[PDB]
Amino acid sequence: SRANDAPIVLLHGFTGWGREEMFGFKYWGGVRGDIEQWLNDNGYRTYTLAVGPLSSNWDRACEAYAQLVGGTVDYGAAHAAKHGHARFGRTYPGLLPELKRGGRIHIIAHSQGGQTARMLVSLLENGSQEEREYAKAHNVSLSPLFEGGHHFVLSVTTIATPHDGTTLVNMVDFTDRFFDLQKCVLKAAAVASNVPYTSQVYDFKLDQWGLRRQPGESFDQYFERLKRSPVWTSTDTARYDLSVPGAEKLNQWVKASPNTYYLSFATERTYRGALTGNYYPELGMNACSAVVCAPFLGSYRNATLGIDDRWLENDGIVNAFSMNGPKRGSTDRIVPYDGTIKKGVWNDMGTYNVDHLEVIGVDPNPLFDIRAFYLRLAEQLASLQPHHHHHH
Ligand SMILES: [Ca+2]
Ligand SMILES: [Zn+2]
After folding, report:
1. Catalytic pick among 110, 150, 163, 356
2. One matching Pfam family, short form (predicted)?
């Protein structure tokens, strides 16, 4: 039963778009419907964030903050200078000005959005020492995000998040395959990749890098430029953060806040082979991942990198072992759900038999009751005690 009235905020991964994009086909619901609308209809106030799908977690966090409380995106002077991109980005009206007045939110994140959510909490709570110092030494202005002391976030829920990275990035042809994946999702939305749509359709939001699809350019063409751009070749990217080494680095500073509840959901859509020990995609797996991605993930080992048999089970895009919470380079604690949701630790909700895209409804799965999944989750979030009392 309801203990809090915090609104829910939905957040996407390396693919994602606003409610008005993709001609209305939702990331959060896809072919199954509109998850936000369902929650809202059931009495759970819910909103959706849209940030750069290919941008670093940092960039996304800055975008999220500003999208939340309003204003112009501020990536941090130190950060901007270090990576060679703009300091300021786009301007937002603010979905929830209530945040600057004591309110709190629950964040439900998918895929890489889980890393973003964590980072946001971290920055909100602790700010950035580096940014503070840079401001002081150079006399530049400083975003409140980097000051610390903000407590918006009551909880963070992650679904199919590569907390420890994903070995998908180790594919020799990762670059091409990754963009083919973006092409696949466009396909799911009935959007062609070889057509120069004059309407935006899918805004990658690369204002900091000064990149945008030009007139006369199709997605295929656009992706070819992107592949050669700083959003693909620099360390300040989703590409990097998505890697095992990158996730590890992020984990070294992005810690669980003791004042926030964390829930983790893992996904899998594979079966083990008895002779090989490898994992193979199940029947029903989205066509975007079944042919090349899943098999790679289910067979890729790397001793020096620390990738062993535990990493093989996957949901087609991410290794299931990476989803229960940050482990590599992390001090965070992870406890298996036992009926009690604990604060300031990762409550491992278990593993669900659904693939990376099925879980958000981008790919169909009649056996998966998506509406009930999200409503059950929402119910659980609403039951969280903003202050738990200590007892026997
Ligand atoms: Ca399916
Ligand atoms: Zn950046």
Report:
1. 356
2. Lip_C
